[PDB]
């Protein structure tokens, strides 16, 4: 009944580490005392329900706050000038000066200027009044209420799902593909065609009249006759103004491509057609697997048969079905890797192809969103690899994977790790050397000696996609090619203009700075992969510790014997690779932010000139753009960016405090706590007040965790401020 009820070992633990480790292993349900697989799965299911309810509550809170305290209605009239308000500020610590400064956005109270793009998203989606946002918040609140009740219900005795149902892979994948992806995307396309395109074209479609108003003048007669080109006929004109009927068409499903000229975002007809088609594909693919009707596929059979001839990949994929369906960590790793790749994809695609009206001219929101999603992508990738390592050290069965495609990975892990080391070494050596060459050459007053490699291959991709300033004249750039001619009446007439228009972030012009920074990004990705892959492959054992699987995933060490065994557990591989995830995402975000600040400000010949050397990054990006942030508050007064300056210094302080736990280790602090225990016990008066848990220094893995925590939170706070405040102060 003591705090770690799930772990009787921590229950008998008498020191203060009991509380730390109980909180830390609260959610490590697999290793809890007296745990069975069925109970584990049911608990995971209920926790998923609660988590979904949290997500929808967060969404409803954002919606309600913008409805109640935000200037959504005023912003709708003038999207490009009025600054969106996130929520009102309630702070008794604010002075009169801060009150006047934070009173902004055309309201009489202090407020926070939204940098999440929710205003643009909802305006594009079809929200026009605070009432719609409030009703959305109410409905999401009801949804979360139902999800919480469902989570409670699915732990009851008569309503507790079984392990066979949990492990029913075919039905789950069929339903997720067909309905969760497919029918939900179909629902979104229907929403667009019924509510968003009419609202963009100046029609108020809501629940009271969406049943009466026809999305298309012809109705479903074209859909049933098969003359679906009537839904593309009469597209929106280039003189269309978003939210008004002037210049508005009647088409509901088009493939115009490019961007809407006024809003510089893709056409809602194009997006509706996208979601409709993509759903067709997914609803088809959700009929792949066999579920209670004979017709379909058997995933175990597929994996078993996929073994190439003559044992090229050993025994092929035999046993992989069993390992994946038995081990939740492998499923978690696959999910995290896929979702991290998808997060990187959305980060790369939203800025290049904006979808929300007037987002492109909102420079702060774009940078905030890109940085946000790139960081989360990095975290998801690190988690995918960490859970792969946990699977290897906890759930991997060599008897099942005898001569398997997965076992051969462990078989030639030495080759894999050595070659990842080679490529990381080459990339870092050469990228750093070229950067230093450029640094010294510009330093010595002779920039002509800079070694500047043109990214010819990326430029060739841009030319093949439609760029023409490079003059390569290949594929779509060459109007005559089969690629350019076959698609010349669907999307190219708009895409060509969009890509060759220099006012867009679609396929930005690139140069030697882009070459060098891309090779740096390659170095970051390769080294992070090296650390993570090595951790995963050596989690089971090593020449320095062949029996590591007995110790498990996260243990402090093996002692000073055999030369020392620091950070050998393959959890410390994750903890090391987290630094590199932060490093490479920071490089990515610095590249994005500087190139986009230059492009938005209209001087791309600052990035093209200065980015070739590192002092250009240190001066024309960091030092130059740090002035509006650090000048948030000074001796003469304060501005509305004082919060960003304070949070900038805050992230610096946390990043610095992490170095304490990372550098100084447990013995010093343990002995110091012995001294403090002596003092407290020996002083009078205070010694009547006595602890219950014996105070001890933080454990080794605990302190590694705390130091990495302080590092990461620090990273994100510092760049968030610098990316949100410098953009605001420069535009």
């Amino acid at each position: 009944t003591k705090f770690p009820k799930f772990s009787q070992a921590l229950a008998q633990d008498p020191a203060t580490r009991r509380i730390w480790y109980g909180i830390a292993t609260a959610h490590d349900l697999e290793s809890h005392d007296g745990m069975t697989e069925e109970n584990l799965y049911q608990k995971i299911f209920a926790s998923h329900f609660g988590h979904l309810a949290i997500i929808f509550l967060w969404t409803s809170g954002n919606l309600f706050h913008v409805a109640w305290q935000g200037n959504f209605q005023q912003w709708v009239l003038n999207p490009l000038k009025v600054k969106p308000i996130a929520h009102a500020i309630w702070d008794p610590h604010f002075g009169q000066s801060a009150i006047k400064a934070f009173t902004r956005g055309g309201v009489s109270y202090p407020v926070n200027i939204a940098t999440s793009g929710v205003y643009h998203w909802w305006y594009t989606v079809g929200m026009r009044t605070n009432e719609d946002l409030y009703f959305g918040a109410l409905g999401l609140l009801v949804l979360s209420t139902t999800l919480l009740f469902a989570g409670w219900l699915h732990l009851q005795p008569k309503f507790r799902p079984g392990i066979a149902w949990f492990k029913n892979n075919e039905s789950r994948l069929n339903h997720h593909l067909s309905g969760l992806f497919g029918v939900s995307s179909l629902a979104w396309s229907g929403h667009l065609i019924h509510v968003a395109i009419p609202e963009s074209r100046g029609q108020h479609i809501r629940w009271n009249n969406f049943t009466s108003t026809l999305p298309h003048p012809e109705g479903l007669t074209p859909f049933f006759t098969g003359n679906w080109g009537l839904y593309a006929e009469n597209p929106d004109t280039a003189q269309h103004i978003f939210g008004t009927s002037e210049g508005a068409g009647t088409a509901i499903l088009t493939f115009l491509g490019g961007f809407h000229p006024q809003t510089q975002s893709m056409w809602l007809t194009d997006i509706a057609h996208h979601h409709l088609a993509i759903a067709v594909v997914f609803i088809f693919a959700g009929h792949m697997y066999r579920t209670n009707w004979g017709i379909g596929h058997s995933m175990k059979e597929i994996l078993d048969a996929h073994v190439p001839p003559k044992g090229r990949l050993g025994a092929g994929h035999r046993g992989l079905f069993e390992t994946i369906t038995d081990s939740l960590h492998m499923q978690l790793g696959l999910a995290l890797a896929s979702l991290g790749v998808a997060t990187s994809l959305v980060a790369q695609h939203m800025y290049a192809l904006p979808s929300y009206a007037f987002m492109a001219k909102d420079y702060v929101t774009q940078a905030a969103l890109y940085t946000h999603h790139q960081y989360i992508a990095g975290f998801l990738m690190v988690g995918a690899f960490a859970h792969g390592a946990i699977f290897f050290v906890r759930d991997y069965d060599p008897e099942v994977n005898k001569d398997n495609v997965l076992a051969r990975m462990l078989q030639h892990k030495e080759a894999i790790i050595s070659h990842l080391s080679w490529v990381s070494l080459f990339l870092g050596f050469h990228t750093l050397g070229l950067y230093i060459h450029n640094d010294v050459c510009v330093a010595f007053g002779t920039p002509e000696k800079q070694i500047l490699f043109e990214p010819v291959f990326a430029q060739f991709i841009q030319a093949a996609s439609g760029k023409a300033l490079y003059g390569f004249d290949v594929l779509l750039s060459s109007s005559t090619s089969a690629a350019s001619v076959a698609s010349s009446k669907i999307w190219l007439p708009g895409w060509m203009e969009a890509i060759n228009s220099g006012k867009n972030s679609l396929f930005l012009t690139i140069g030697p700075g882009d070459f060098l920074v891309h090779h740096a990004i390659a170095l970051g990705l390769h080294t992070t992969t090296l650390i993570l892959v090595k951790g995963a492959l050596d989690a089971r054992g090593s020449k320095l510790m062949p029996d590591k699987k007995d110790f498990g995933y996260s243990f402090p060490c093996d002692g000073p014997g055999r030369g020392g065994t620091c950070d050998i557990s393959a959890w410390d591989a994750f903890y090391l690779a987290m630094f590199w995830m932060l490093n490479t995402i920071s490089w990515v975000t610095f590249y994005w932010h500087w190139k986009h600040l230059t492009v938005w400000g209209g001087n791309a010949a600052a990035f093209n000139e200065s980015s070739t050397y590192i002092m250009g990054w240190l001066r024309d990006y960091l030092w130059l753009n740090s002035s509006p942030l650090i000048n948030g508050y000074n001796a003469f007064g304060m501005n509305a960016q004082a919060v960003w300056a304070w949070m900038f210094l805050f992230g610096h302080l946390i990043w610095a405090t992490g170095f304490m736990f990372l550098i100084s280790w447990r013995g010093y602090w343990q002995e110091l706590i012995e001294t403090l225990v002596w003092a407290h016990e020996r002083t009078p008066i205070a010694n009547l007040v006595k602890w219950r848990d014996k105070p001890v220094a933080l454990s080794i893995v605990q302190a590694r965790l705390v130091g990495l925590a302080h590092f990461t939170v620090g990273f994100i706070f510092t760049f968030a401020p610098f990316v949100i405040a410098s953009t605001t102060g420069k535009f």
Binding site: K43, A46, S47, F49, G50, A53, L57, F64, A67, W68, N130, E131, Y134, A137, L138, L141, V142, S144, T145, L148, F149, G151, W152, L155, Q156
Partner: peptide, 30 residues
């Protein structure tokens, strides 16, 4: 303009959700 009654109704639904959250936390704790 969101009204006082609207805010109070949303707050009531939020309180119902809170009660359900305590219940779900209990049932996950057992």
């Amino acid at each position: 303009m969101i009204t006082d009654s609207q805010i109070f109704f949303a707050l009531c639904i939020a309180l119902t959700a809170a009660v359900l959250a305590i219940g779900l936390g209990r049932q996950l704790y057992v």
